[PDB]
């Protein structure tokens, strides 16, 4: 379809990991979503919330609608569960790597299904719990999902990083190595 | 593998030449079974799983009428409202040159994805030995691109990387040696 820009409402419900998600994207960039369990509209950029507003209950309502559509489809589909699709993982920095210049390490998980994922950062072989951030289970046009994971760090020659991704489509956790 | 079933839907607005096209998809485990198309005017089953859902939806006239008003009630409304913050969002790129024998022109942090990066050596545009990556989405509403250039270093040679972007009125150039 010929289009200059594409604005899309995306939402899913499932049995595990996040039982629901309701977001709105503009040119494949998530603009805002509705935080289920907190039930308020969370904007990706702070400047978005100052210029727009969204009735967060529209997502909670649509999630409830998709909930019964799931149960209805579960019955008609003869309880069929889809095939687990393994993900592709890539790690790259946000800014040019310079020693002593704070940067953000981006771990991109792509082309997986279902949206059930364990992602964790490792620096020099031990868990990193602080300075970490993650994106939503972003949708793709081919009905699979991709996701972002961020880690703020100071580039050092001694440190080597790993983005460990765990998914049902994998036999073992996937270690994606990265170093300067 | 644990027991897990998923249901997802899409509400897509397609803007082009001042028009709006709405498509509403109904998906169960990556299988799109039901779809409403604004250019079609009514629901139609995409697979055998969605025939009873599409037939029931086409009988309810209010459902068919509500969806036909979406390209003007929602698609046109959000497209005009998000104009300044999304359509006309301009973030200027940052250009860096490093030798890592190749030369890396690292363009970071820019939103309008359409960008072109050319390599010049002593005023001559280089085409052979140019390796550029794809567009790299950061998720921060920002993009990246890295253009490599295989060079035969000569003393006195001036390698320049120019960048032309919609967020720039004049091209930005960075030189090496």
């Amino acid at each position: 379809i010929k289009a200059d820009h594409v604005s899309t409402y995306a939402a899913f419900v499932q049995t595990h990991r996040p039982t629901g998600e309701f977001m709105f994207e503009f040119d494949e960039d998530e603009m805002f979503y509705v935080d289920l369990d907190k039930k308020e509209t969370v904007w990706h950029l702070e400047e978005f919330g100052q210029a727009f507003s969204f009735e967060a209950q529209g997502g909670l309502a649509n999630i409830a609608i998709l909930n019964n559509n799931l149960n209805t489809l579960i019955q008609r589909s003869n309880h069929t569960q889809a095939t687990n699709d393994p993900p592709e993982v890539t790690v790259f920095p946000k800014e040019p790597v310079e020693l002593g210049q704070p940067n953000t390490l981006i771990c991109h998980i792509d082309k997986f299904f279902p949206p059930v994922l364990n992602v964790t950062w490792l620096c020099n072989g031990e868990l990193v719990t602080e300075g970490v951030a993650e994106s939503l289970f972003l949708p793709r046009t081919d009905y699979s999902f991709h996701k972002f994971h961020y880690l703020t760090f100071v580039p050092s020659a001694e440190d080597f990083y790993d983005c460990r991704v765990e998914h049902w489509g994998l036999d073992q956790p996937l270690l994606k190595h990265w170093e300067a | 593998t644990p027991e897990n079933y998923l249901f997802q839907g899409r509400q897509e607005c397609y803007a082009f030449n001042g028009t709006q096209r709405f498509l509403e998809r109904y998906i169960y485990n990556r299988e799109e079974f039901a779809r409403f198309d604004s250019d079609v005017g009514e629901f139609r089953a995409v697979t055998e799983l969605g025939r009873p859902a599409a037939e029931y939806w086409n009988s309810q006239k209010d459902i068919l009428e509500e969806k036909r008003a979406v390209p003007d009630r929602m698609c046109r409304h959000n497209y005009e409202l998000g104009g300044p913050m999304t359509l006309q969002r301009r973030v200027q790129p940052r250009v860096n040159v490093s030798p890592s024998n190749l030369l890396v022109c690292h363009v970071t942090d820019f939103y309008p994805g359409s960008i072109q990066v050319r390599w010049f050596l002593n005023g001559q545009e280089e085409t052979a030995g140019v390796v550029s990556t794809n567009l790299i989405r950061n998720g921060d509403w920002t993009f990246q691109i890295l253009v490599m250039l295989e060079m035969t270093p000569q003393q006195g040679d001036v390698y320049t990387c120019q960048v032309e972007h919609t967020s720039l009125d004049s091209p930005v150039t960075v030189e090496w040696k």
Partner: peptide
């Protein structure tokens, strides 16, 4: 101002 939204319909 405010952004618009739409109801997904219910299945048979």
């Amino acid at each position: 101002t405010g952004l618009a939204w739409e109801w997904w319909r219910t299945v048979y």
